[model samples]
Target: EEERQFRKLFVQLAGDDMEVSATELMNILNKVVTRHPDLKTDGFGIDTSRSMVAVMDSDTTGKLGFEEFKYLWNNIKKWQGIYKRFDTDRSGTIGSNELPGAFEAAGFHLNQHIYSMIIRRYSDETGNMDFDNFISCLVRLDAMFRAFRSLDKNGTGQIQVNIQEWLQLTMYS
Candidate 1:
């Protein structure tokens, strides 16, 4: 029943179009939330080009189906939520000094050295990162943290692994 309603919405909004562009998505959102004007002007914090590229999956050829739409929508939703929580001053960009606090807010304990490394990897030329870069950084960090936690199966803050097991996990992962 829910999917049926969503399909109806998809047909109504998308019409004959196969994929939803960032601009189109923004327009839809703006209309849906007209009472809140910030979502209209500011959007979900993802750049147009980056959003399009990110939404395209391996099975998709510059187009998005309903299945792919779910994936893209969920990712954008999560990233935007995270950005809103961390962008304390609503500056639309995360400054270098703010990154560490953001990481801590997300429950990631980062020391000064590791935090600097993350900033170097993701920050823009001005040492600040817009939501796009920040989202990318969050994805990578989430995966890395998961892998480390998985490897540390004993919850002893370490892992004891044989060379072959380590090689297999590293190579296949």
Candidate 2:
């Protein structure tokens, strides 16, 4: 069963603890790229893993418990599906032209300038994104969007923060 596989893998990766650290998660995700070569680019780095963990670390533990990992895993699967669907040419990378529809499909509809900014940040020299960078981009976007929504307490679509608070919110994440 999927549940059994998740538990077994979690225990294998977590060792004696019930939590998996960023490094461990990065290792496994990178391994996934090995099995799915189309996803291979620069590979899943520690920064990517940290951003992902920060998103799903509901208890602020800086690591993922079983439930948190399950949620993160499901999101990864969903994102992978989106990536495949958008890579319609089977090019193993999403080109700049495909970026908008891909992001829209993933539920983030931004302006053209924003899409350019994202492509500049996440794509390679040719302005194409492989699976690793695609996942990284989506994970950060999802986290930042949720963070903004949570801060927008009045639902007026804006929030105010001092310098220190802004630093805390954006520095490492």
lDDT of each: 0.61, 0.85
Clashing pairs in 2: none
Look at candidate 2 and tell me the lDDT of residue 50.
Answer: 90
Give the C-alpha miss distance for residue 6 in model 1, angstroms: 7.7
- Number of the top candidate by lDDT? 2
User: Distance (Å) between predicted and true CA of 25, model 1?
Assistant: 14
Q: What is the lDDT of residue 57 in candidate 2?
A: 77
- For candidate 1, which ten residues in a row score worst on lDDT? 37-46
Task: Estimate the Cα RMSD of every predicted model relative to the unseen true structure.
Answer: 7.2, 1.7
**Residue pairs in candidate 1 whose N, alpha carbon or C atoms collide under 3 angstroms:** none
lDDT of 2 by residue, 1-173 (tens): 98798788889987777788999999999888898887647788888889888777768888989888887777788888888888888888999988998889889989989988998998889889988889878887887898899899999998999999798688656
